[PDB]
Amino acid sequence: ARYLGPKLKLSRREGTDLFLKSGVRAIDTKCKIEQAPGQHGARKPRLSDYGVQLREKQKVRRIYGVLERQFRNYYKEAARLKGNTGENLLALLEGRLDNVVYRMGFGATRAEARQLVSHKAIMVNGRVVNIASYQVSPNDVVSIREKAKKQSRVKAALELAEQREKPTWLEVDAGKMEGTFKRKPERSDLSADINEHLIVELYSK
Amino acid sequence: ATVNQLVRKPRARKVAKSNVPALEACPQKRGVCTRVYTTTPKKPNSALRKVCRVRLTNGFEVTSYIGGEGHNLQEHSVILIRGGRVKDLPGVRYHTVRGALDCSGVKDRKQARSKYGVKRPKA
């Protein structure tokens, strides 16, 4: 359903450092920002007021990999929530089952991660819940299953993320590969560089 | 700046202007083709486009267009009616969708895809 690619194309129209392709080489070598991305009109593009938010929509839709269906069925219940935009909508994208697995180090890309989850490798306290819109609440656990536990893909996530920032809101054991969300997300350390509030005000045009 | 002169022809090029008279129920229908007409000399050189009339209780008589391709659009048939008056045509106020029954229309024109409903070529 999640369109699948060409994947590096998305980076040449959405932007730089995307978790889509976080690993090996193709960063600054091939992602074609400042070189010439939209080559034909690159002499002069012109932006728009809806323009700048519609590609920040795009950012959030394509970095984590989700439908417009989810973008309306997360909005449905968000309309009851008590907090701000970047807790009622954004915070959920770092914490749905297919996207938490990369944050912990069980797959080296965000397009990898969803596909390890959909292939029955991952559980949450004993539940194989590959219905991947399922969002892992704080403190209840999440693991890779036994014969998938130390599979080549996990190691090449762990020995590459080792030098990188391990963020404060969740934890993992790198040697038995299991973890949870340790506290609630906050719009002050969540580490997406986006202006959060702007995906929800885009529905006001 | 002088409204009963301006109102006609200022600046727009889609325009509203249409005249769509009578109603009685709804404008879409099934259309007994009542009698077939092939005639009436004009500067638009209007060959083969054989308009028909429609027995509908409306207060005055009414007429409808061939919609598109398909020569055998026969006066005993009861295909479907919708609005849209092409500038080519006096007297008419509606055009057919003529693909049901025995009528065919679309003989082999592969480009129709969802537009009228057709299957794929040698792809």
Binding site: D49, G83, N84, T85, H197, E201, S204 | -
Partner: protein, 150 residues
């Protein structure tokens, strides 16, 4: 580190004797990050020059709006001919959902929480000329105390 934006212009060019005559105008605003905002108009022979004559005019001192701290406490009367106008505060956490037809009057100082779009006229010159004169007519948190005692 002051803030500079435009909001409106006229196509102002006409038939005469005679061919065609042309002119070039603006309407602009400026702000300081410590809750200060201002406005004004210009004209020139050239378009980015009618912006400069405007924005040099918007730089006059910049009114300190009563902002305590991420929102504001009273909807001041932006009196005009039929605009009306009245803003609607919001509870300190939700954003500047106001009329993008004028929003730069509140955006240039950073103000995170206020809304209302342009309630009686969809012409910016009307909801601009109205907003800045409500903002100069305001009262501090400290003034409303005196207004209701001593």
């Amino acid at each position: 580190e002051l803030q500079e934006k435009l909001i409106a212009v006229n196509r102002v060019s006409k038939t005469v004797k005679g061919g065609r005559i042309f002119s070039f105008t603006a309407l602009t605003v400026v702000g300081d990050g410590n809750g200060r905002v201002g406005f004004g108009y210009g004209k020139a022979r050239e378009v980015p020059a009618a912006i400069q004559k405007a924005m040099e005019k918007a730089r006059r001192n910049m009114i300190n709006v009563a902002l305590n701290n991420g929102t504001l406490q009273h909807p001041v009367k932006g009196v005009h001919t039929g605009s009306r106008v009245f803003m609607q505060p919001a509870s300190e956490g939700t954003g500047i959902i106001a009329g993008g037809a004028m929003r730069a009057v509140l955006e240039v100082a950073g103000v995170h929480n206020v809304l209302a779009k342009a309630y009686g006229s969809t012409n910016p010159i009307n909801v601009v000329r109205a907003t800045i004169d409500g903002l100069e007519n305001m009262n501090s948190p400290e003034m409303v105390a005196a207004k209701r005692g001593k």
